[PDB]
Scaffold this active site. Structure first.
Site, PDB file in Angstrom:
ATOM      1  N   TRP A  21      -3.640  -5.296   4.678  1.00 20.02           N
ATOM      2  CA  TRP A  21      -4.734  -5.337   3.721  1.00 20.02           C
ATOM      3  C   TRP A  21      -4.531  -4.310   2.614  1.00 20.02           C
ATOM      4  O   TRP A  21      -4.009  -3.219   2.856  1.00 20.02           O
ATOM      5  CB  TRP A  21      -6.072  -5.087   4.419  1.00 20.02           C
ATOM      6  CG  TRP A  21      -6.360  -3.639   4.663  1.00 20.02           C
ATOM      7  CD1 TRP A  21      -6.898  -2.741   3.786  1.00 20.02           C
ATOM      8  CD2 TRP A  21      -6.136  -2.926   5.880  1.00 20.02           C
ATOM      9  NE1 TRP A  21      -7.015  -1.509   4.383  1.00 20.02           N
ATOM     10  CE2 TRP A  21      -6.553  -1.599   5.671  1.00 20.02           C
ATOM     11  CE3 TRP A  21      -5.620  -3.283   7.126  1.00 20.02           C
ATOM     12  CZ2 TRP A  21      -6.468  -0.629   6.666  1.00 20.02           C
ATOM     13  CZ3 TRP A  21      -5.534  -2.320   8.111  1.00 20.02           C
ATOM     14  CH2 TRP A  21      -5.958  -1.007   7.877  1.00 20.02           C
ATOM     15  N   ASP A  26     -10.188   2.662  -1.542  1.00 18.16           N
ATOM     16  CA  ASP A  26     -10.218   3.703  -0.513  1.00 18.16           C
ATOM     17  C   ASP A  26      -8.989   4.605  -0.620  1.00 18.16           C
ATOM     18  O   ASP A  26      -9.066   5.806  -0.367  1.00 18.16           O
ATOM     19  CB  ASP A  26     -10.283   3.068   0.872  1.00 18.16           C
ATOM     20  CG  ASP A  26     -10.548   4.087   1.965  1.00 18.16           C
ATOM     21  OD1 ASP A  26     -10.109   5.246   1.813  1.00 18.16           O
ATOM     22  OD2 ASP A  26     -11.197   3.728   2.970  1.00 18.16           O
TER      23      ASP A  26
END
Ligand SMILES: NC(=O)C1=CN([C@@H]2O[C@H](COP(=O)(O)OP(=O)(O)OC[C@H]3O[C@@H](n4cnc5c(N)ncnc54)[C@H](OP(=O)(O)O)[C@@H]3O)[C@@H](O)[C@H]2O)C=CC1
Length: 162
Positions: A21, A26
């Site tokens: 992913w 983040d």
């Protein structure tokens, strides 16, 4: 010292030494956090580094052999020595971006634990180990809402409790 790691809700951290992913969001936060601080990353992990190298940063490459040469990060084969070094410089903050083997070895004695939860799930050959709730507690928790369900995640910080 603090340990930063992320895992899927289903219980996946990665596969083929890479991140299935992509969450640059983040990641940017993590990169910003490690700015002005010394961090150690395992060699297998370095292979996953999607945004390498990492200039203007005190990064150290961890390898089995001291003789082996690594670029962009210092090569240290002594796990104990790294710990002592951090102890010597309490003012300097320590952040570890893997590898999992490194995390496991230092899992028993960690002053700061960082946990990232992903709303979505990914398939892989690597599963995260069990977490001892009694060993560590969450100082505080943060909730982030994204348009895509997978994008939405919850950030929490854990610290050792007597
Ligand atoms: N849940 C999570 O957030 C985390 C996820 N990950 C994922 O896992 C991947 C890495 O895990 P994995 O592939 O299992 O391997 P690791 O990244 O955990 O491998 C660690 C490497 O560091 C070196 N090393 C290990 N122990 C020592 C020691 N005692 N002394 C000196 N050097 C040492 C070795 O390098 P060598 O043998 O190559 O010289 C070893 O291969 C990352 O790329 C990422 O995708 C990684 C860390 C945390």
């Amino acid at each position: 010292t603090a340990f930063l790691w992320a895992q899927d809700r289903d219980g996946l951290i990665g596969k083929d030494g890479h991140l299935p992913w992509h969450l640059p969001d983040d990641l940017h936060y993590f990169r910003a956090q490690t700015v002005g601080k010394i961090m150690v990353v395992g060699r297998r992990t370095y292979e996953s580094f999607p945004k390498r190298p990492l200039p203007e940063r005190t990064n150290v490459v961890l390898t089995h052999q001291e003789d082996y040469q690594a670029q962009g990060a210092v090569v240290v084969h002594d796990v104990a020595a790294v710990f002592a070094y951090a102890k010597q410089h309490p003012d300097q903050e320590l952040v570890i971006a893997g590898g999992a083997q490194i995390f496991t070895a230092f899992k028993d004695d960690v002053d700061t634990l960082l946990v990232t939860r992903l709303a979505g799930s990914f398939e892989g050959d690597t599963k995260m180990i069990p977490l001892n709730w009694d060993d560590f507690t969450k100082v505080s928790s943060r909730t982030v809402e994204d348009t895509n369900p997978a994008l939405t995640h919850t950030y929490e910080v854990w610290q050792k409790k007597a």
